Design a protein around this ligand. Sequence first.
Ligand code: ADP
Lengths: 214, 546, 71
Amino acid sequence: DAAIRGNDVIFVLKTIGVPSACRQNEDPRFVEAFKCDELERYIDNNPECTLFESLRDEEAYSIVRIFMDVDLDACLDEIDYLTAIQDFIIEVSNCVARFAFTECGAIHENVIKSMRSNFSLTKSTNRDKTSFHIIFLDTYTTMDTLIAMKRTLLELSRSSENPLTRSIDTAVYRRKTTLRVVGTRKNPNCDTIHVMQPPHDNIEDYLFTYVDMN
Amino acid sequence: FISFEDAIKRVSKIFINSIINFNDLDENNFTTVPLVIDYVTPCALCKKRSHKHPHQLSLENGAIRIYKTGNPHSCKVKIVPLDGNKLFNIAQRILDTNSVLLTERGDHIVWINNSWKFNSEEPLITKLILSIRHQLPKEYSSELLCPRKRKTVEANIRDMLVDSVETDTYPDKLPFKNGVLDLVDGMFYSGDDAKKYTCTVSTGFKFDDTKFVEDSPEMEELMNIINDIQPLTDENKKNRELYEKTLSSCLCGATKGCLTFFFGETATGKSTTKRLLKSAIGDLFVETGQTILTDVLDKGPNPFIANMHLKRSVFCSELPDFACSGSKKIRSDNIKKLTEPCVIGRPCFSNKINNRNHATIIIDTNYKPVFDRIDNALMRRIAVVRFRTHFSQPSGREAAENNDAYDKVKLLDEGLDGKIQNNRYRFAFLYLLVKWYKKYHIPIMKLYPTPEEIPDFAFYLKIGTLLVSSSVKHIPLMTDLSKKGYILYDNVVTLPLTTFQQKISKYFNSRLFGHDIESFINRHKKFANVSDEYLQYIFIEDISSP
Amino acid sequence: KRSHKHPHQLSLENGAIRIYKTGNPHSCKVKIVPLDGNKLFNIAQRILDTNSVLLTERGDHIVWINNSWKF
Ligand SMILES: Nc1ncnc2c1ncn2[C@@H]1O[C@H](COP(=O)(O)OP(=O)(O)O)[C@@H](O)[C@H]1O
């Protein structure tokens, strides 16, 4: 299949709402392509930038990681946070494994163990809000698979009871989707950004477009 | 969406204390007006005492969130769902984990105690629910405690299953009570990893890694016993190799196309090997009667074939002598039928007429085997292993040494026995079997016939070597056959019957060859005219260009 | 981990017992314990604790009545 094909170039949008023609012509202001070290250096030089991660050609290369977004407008203590996050990760891993077995035809056990092996988490500087993005490094699939799965995720969110499981946004599974780069300003006049976590210290582990099978 | 009254009832039951702002709540401003709780008792969310601030309700994602104004850490957040049967959600969650499946045979298989349990008259679904209770969030265990709710969840699970899945598709896996052993590398899976391969059978005993060790005194004793039964000499090198191959083939779950004969005079240790194998693989070993080799299978029920299903080793012992009176010759059709991937047979009070064949069939005998009809098809579906080592009491030491059957006599030791029935060499034998399987069968597993033995076959083996079929290519030497005296009447090298018997008499002694000679006569009988009893054959020994 | 240098701590909330490590909770895992539920389930567990009823291989159940295993 892909084999040698492993994504390492980072395609980035420097402004929300990019005009279509400028994207087609590869404008140097709203569209750019860096490497991991290049992107890190660019972020370091300009802390006021606003960058969004997205794919460029979905008809040629269509391999990505699994990414999810959670946003809930309430703060909570530590122990409850850990209990809720472990319950949520167990539930979502089970749901994805069941979908993979039922439709994709893969192996439930391998999928669930790969999903539960390694996962990346973020945090928000907001005091009264809890939002994060979860990216699974050891799981790979195409965009249309996630688009199909969005229904199962929506019913999972509606049926469940855990506060963050109710806060899963299924709208991100859309054609020409975008994701904000961690540690980058969302608005030009907004100081709310995403902070890092002790388990991982590399940007490579927090990008869903990075494809490197092991 | 549900009626507003039901939501108000739920939110009023969640708050143990009453609400003094009950009347002012309406369908248009239920998310704007703060509500006042009379604090005579601590609130349900957080105990504390007499919260000094009111609460508020918000609607999002079809759910009602309760939050207290002020410091967020003072009170806990509560979420009220809109609709959705809780039992249905629990059933979906349980079905998600792939712990229960439906097979092609119309039965349900569950996964508990690291084993694929399977029954047709028991409610294994309820046991699975009760066991899996722990993995679910704590708000579901209380519901799962009641039996009626368990029955409802089981009904939902039954309604949610529509497809069938194949079972036992891996021929190189050995299932145990607490895991699956991989015959390729010899490393033993456990826990969930064994659930990947759907194996509905098991050896019946748990697997222990402590005794699965190459070096142990029990291993040395087993090696000594094996050497005593089968010496490692140059003569029986092929015999010992065939013995090892046949023993190792009992682990593979594929289909075997040969039958092995354990031929030996008496007290040669065949029962010892059978009991060791039984102690090794457990219940995958099944002993059956001789009826299959003597009767037909289609008519009436046949519970033996029903029990043969999916077994990996079948043993038929104590073969009666066919030389004596009342003999029933072995049915060649049964032999040809027993080497097929599917065997047709019906159980008692049933309709299934197909069974999977994964069994290595081993027949223990004391005398020579006798069949009714012999053909080339039978010669490719038979094999034999010769057992020549006596184990006798020194009281009959000389009584056995004079015998020409036994080749080496040893002391009959009253040891073993119970120890073998005590599984003293259970795990020791598995290591040797796995080693032999790696030595022989890993690239391609396939058995091979041994037509050279079974002297009843020998005549039929000789004729093909001795006789050749006349054809047009024997025309250019019509002089040579004219030397023999044959004729080209009907454009074929004829052979008078008188000439044929006078020819074969000087090379074959007939009598015991007479019956099969006559069978050859009638089977290949050709009458060109009323009285020209010619044959379509050429003797290669004397008509090798004479 | 090694030796759990920070002592553990027990809490009660919503009829549920919680176990968590003091100091840095991220260095350990929180455990949950339930409360007593149905009286009938507790009675069944108490009865089963005495090993007075056993299940055989043939799918039948044997009981211990009048100082004799009845099947
Ligand atoms: N290597 C050995 N060491 C000790 N005893 C042996 C050995 N080989 C055979 N025997 C004894 O010889 C007897 C042979 O019995 P059995 O297996 O029924 O032979 P057969 O099947 O030929 O009658 C067994 O009871 C066994 O105890």
